Design a protein around this ligand. Structure first.
Ligand SMILES: [Cl-]
Length: 247
């Protein structure tokens, strides 16, 4: 199985620490007694391949050899030192949290929160598009990809127009992080690298704007954001895979 590597000064303290971790549901891959050496750090490095999070050492009341510490530093293996057990636990939990956040940041572009915008006014047509809108459903967040869905009458074929991402939100000049549904109208700034759609040409003020969800976006949302996402937001998402023709 997979798990962290622990080390204690004595056998008894080791047993106690292991019992503690048992109650904490923290899995242990291997153990050791006495000073930490390069070999033990390597033994954690074995765990590095299977689980990056679990390639860490919980060391209780134990000297760490400079060689071992240096190898750990060279190969990204965390070594945790503590005089008391609970401190070690705390350090580990914080570590796992940090790992979670770092995993979020790579999927930051991917995670998109569902929202439907009805344009109230237009301040800048393009480069960058700025639009006074009110969130009629869902929740508008920063860095949210926006798209307008519309079918040309002659073609009768659905067109998806990606406007770009939201870089700023402001209401009465006051900067906002997000805008919930039903909230009073706000002005949002959407911009993208390269050529960008233009109001009064590609799209009109009447056209309703939707968050640009993608199968990948869904997958990311259900991978890291399950706790956060409202039921209504899931509902909206399922409504949105239809308009975006998602599998
Ligand atoms: Cl996309």
């Amino acid at each position: 199985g997979k798990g962290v590597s622990v080390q204690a000064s004595t056998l008894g303290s080791l047993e106690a620490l292991l019992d503690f971790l048992k109650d904490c549901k923290i899995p242990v891959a291997n153990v050791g007694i006495g000073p930490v050496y390069k070999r033990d750090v390597m033994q954690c490095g074995i765990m590095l391949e299977k689980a990056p999070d679990y390639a860490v050492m919980l060391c209780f009341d134990v000297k760490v050899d400079k060689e071992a510490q240096q190898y750990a530093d060279e190969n990204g293996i965390k070594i945790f030192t503590a005089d008391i057990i609970y401190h070690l636990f705390d350090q580990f939990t914080k570590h796992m949290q940090e790992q979670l956040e770092k995993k979020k940041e790579e999927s930051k572009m991917l995670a998109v929160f569902p929202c439907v915008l009805n344009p109230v006014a237009v301040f800048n047509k393009t480069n960058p598009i700025v639009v006074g809108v009110d969130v009629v459903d869902g929740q508008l967040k920063l860095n949210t990809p926006i798209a307008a869905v519309k079918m040309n009458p002659t073609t009768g074929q659905k067109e998806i127009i990606s406007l770009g991402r939201v870089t700023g939100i402001e209401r009465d000049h006051k900067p906002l992080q997000v805008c919930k549904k039903g909230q009073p109208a706000v002005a949002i700034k959407i911009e993208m690298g390269g050529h960008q759609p233009a109001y009064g040409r590609h799209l009109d003020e009447k056209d309703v704007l939707y968050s640009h969800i993608s199968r990948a976006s869904i997958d990311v949302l259900k991978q890291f954001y399950r706790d956060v996402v409202t039921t209504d937001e899931w509902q909206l998402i399922i409504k949105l895979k239809s308009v975006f023709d998602v599998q």
